Amino acid sequence: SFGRDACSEMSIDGLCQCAPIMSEYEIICPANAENPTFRLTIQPKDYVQIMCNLTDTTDYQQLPKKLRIGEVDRVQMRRCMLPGHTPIASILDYLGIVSPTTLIFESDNLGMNITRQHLDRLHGLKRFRFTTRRLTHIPANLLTDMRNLSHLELRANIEEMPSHLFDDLENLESIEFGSNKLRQMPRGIFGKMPKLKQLNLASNQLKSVPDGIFDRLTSLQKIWLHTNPWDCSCPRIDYLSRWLNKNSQKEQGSAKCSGSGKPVRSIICPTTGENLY
Ligand SMILES: *[C@@H]1O[C@H](CO[C@@H]2O[C@@H](C)[C@@H](O)[C@@H](O)[C@@H]2O)[C@@H](O)[C@H](O)[C@H]1NC(C)=O
Ligand SMILES: *[C@@H]1O[C@H](CO)[C@@H](O)[C@H](O)[C@H]1NC(C)=O
């Protein structure tokens, strides 16, 4: 495991400078650079922060060599590029990071779209957060085999969500899809969520939801649907207005009608005699 002795030795050969700050260590790569390629913040047996300043994926060869961080709970990556068509776990293995349960990936310099391969060997994760100001495509197989995942956060200006995104994922307790550009929610997306307690869909472009979309959320406790331009015309808002009125205790904040500004829960649609779902 990385400690005092490893930090002192790193400052001797001067490939990367190391300085112990508080109960943590700061690694600058390359040494004495005004704008370093890598700035690592390591707290042994707790967390690792990787601050990147890369122009292209080949800059990863400038990472500290033979570094053995060991077991940590959280890995935070900031401004880092997706390592081409190579898993993110390969960066983690090279730095000697062992079995992290939380991965945070935040970057405006991705260099490419995220794939299923980028998450290979990260099946053990319990918490995953992907953040970017860049418009990104979410493939249908992105979260396949992420069976230990209980907390998912995607803030990547996503417009569409694939229908089979949560296929075979059953341990999910929290889904944070707020502050994206979502115009639609596909029917059957929350069909197999027996443990889901929190769902955030606030600050998107949702005008409607398919009928029966939340009916299988048996463990649901909190839901965010505000800051969406909801179409409160009848019968379009019939299902959501009735559902929000019945589950009023679960709603966090207030979903409002694009026109009037009235809460969605206050709409009572008349009966025309048509078929319901
Ligand atoms: C990111 O993806 C954009 C859209 O990709 C399209 O959709 C996928 C499902 C495939 O069919 C692919 O062949 C299509 O191109 C691209 O337009 C965009 O260039 C990609 N971004 C980068 C940086 O490569
Ligand atoms: C990243 O490096 C460039 C020079 O390549 C520099 O202009 C920029 O300020 C650096 N970013 C930070 C956060 O220091």
Residue numbers in the entry: 28 to 304
Paper text:
endogenous protein Spätzle (Spz) that is unique to insects. related to mammalian growth factors, such as the nerve growth factor (NGF) (Hoffmann et al., 2008; Mizuguchi et al., 1998). segregated in two blocks capped by cysteine-rich regions. dimerization followed by receptor clustering with cell-specific signaling molecules.
in truncating the receptor following the hybrid LRR technology (Kim et al., 2007). technology and referred to as TollN6-VLR (Kim et al., 2007). arc-shape typical of the leucine-rich repeat (LRR) fold. is tethered to the first beta-strand by a disulfide bond (Cys34-Cys45). disulfide bonds stabilize the LRRNT cap in Toll. anchors the fourth strand of the cap to the first leucine-rich repeat (LRR1). five-residue-long beta-strands in LRR1–4 and three-residue-long in LRR5 and LRR6. in the first block of LRRs in Toll to form a hydrophobic spine. C-terminal capping structure (LRRCT) of VLR B.61. to protect the hydrophobic core of the last LRR from solvent exposure.
